[PDB]
């Protein structure tokens, strides 16, 4: 199972979060925040590059992945979009993906998931219907940890991409 | 009025339909195609690099932007949403802005142009009602032109894109 974060922010939360299931389930990882990508180009040199050639593989060999995003401007980040950019239904085509999105409080969040949601769809991922939206509460950025309420409903997002995973 | 191409691709059809608006209304353009940021990472350092403070400068004394964005995944290309993460409402509040979206096949544009819209709106730009779709066939990349078809439509949209700036 790969987790992948979507906040190019080091000492951004969706990193935090990311990095939590990472560990708590020893999933792999891809932190956008270390992991830079260029801009996206539409070149074939671009392909060429490890950092893409890695992506893609990583992406492909994952039986399950989650996919974490902060809300900006009311959707995902421009760092993950570009990512996708270099992918395809190649490597998305039947993945089960659970979607989670960090927003800021208040409503916020929506948007970033019906975002992540909606270009899932065009790379035919198979999008679990559980989705979740973290606000800076749930995020403890000093202990660089999650809250307790919210580890819960993390395991059930979890625990049915894995379902999901094993079915199809 | 500013201009902004989507695609980041230099070989790309954004490209050129963005290029002939620039042209045929001798309007400002930044072309992602060649204005090549670094992938936002929320950092000071990053602000005050050159292309950043143009974009923000070049954003906030535009009067009105038409906004080009191929369909990438059901999305805006990521080269753009990279570059409006730069930025915020404090260089979009109220901007009079229109809607343009390159894709292919009857079915596809609508997503890329709901992500357009809801991202500008989570930026307080003035989205004005007009957005189009234009469709690869419409686009002759080797002779870099948009077909006679296309022309009316953006004329339509540039003038009334005008016509909330003056307001
Ligand atoms: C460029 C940018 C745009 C933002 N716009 C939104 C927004 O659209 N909705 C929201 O809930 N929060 C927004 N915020 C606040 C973030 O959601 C908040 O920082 C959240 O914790 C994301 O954390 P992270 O990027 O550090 O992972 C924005 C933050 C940034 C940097
Ligand atoms: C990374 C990538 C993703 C794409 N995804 C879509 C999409 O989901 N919907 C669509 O209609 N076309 C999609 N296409 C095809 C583009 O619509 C087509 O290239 C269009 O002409 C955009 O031109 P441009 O990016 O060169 O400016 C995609 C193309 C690329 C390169």
Same mark, same amino acid.
């Given at each position: 199972m790969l987790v992948i974060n979507?906040?190019?922010?080091?000492?951004?939360r969706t990193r935090i979060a990311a990095s939590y299931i990472a560990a708590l389930y020893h999933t792999d990882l891809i932190d956008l925040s270390e992991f830079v990508l260029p801009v996206?180009? /539409?070149?074939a040199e671009q392909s060429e590059l490890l950092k893409v050639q890695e992506l893609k593989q990583r992406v492909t060999k994952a039986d399950a992945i989650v996919l974490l995003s902060p809300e900006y401007h009311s959707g995902m980040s421009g760092a993950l979009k570009n990512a996708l950019d270099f992918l395809s239904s190649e490597q998305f085509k039947y993945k089960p993906v659970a979607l989670l999105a960090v927003a800021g409080?208040?409503? /916020?969040?929506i948007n970033a998931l019906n975002n992540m949601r909606t270009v899932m769809r065009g790379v035919y991922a198979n999008v679990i219907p559980k989705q979740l939206v973290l606000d800076p509460?749930?995020?403890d950025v000093e202990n660089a940890t999650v809250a307790e309420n919210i580890k819960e409903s993390i395991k059930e997002l979890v625990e049915e991409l894995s379902m999901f995973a094993k079915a199809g």
């Open positions: 979507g906040t190019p922010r080091k000492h951004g996206f180009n /539409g070149e409080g208040g409503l /916020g969040g509460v749930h995020i």
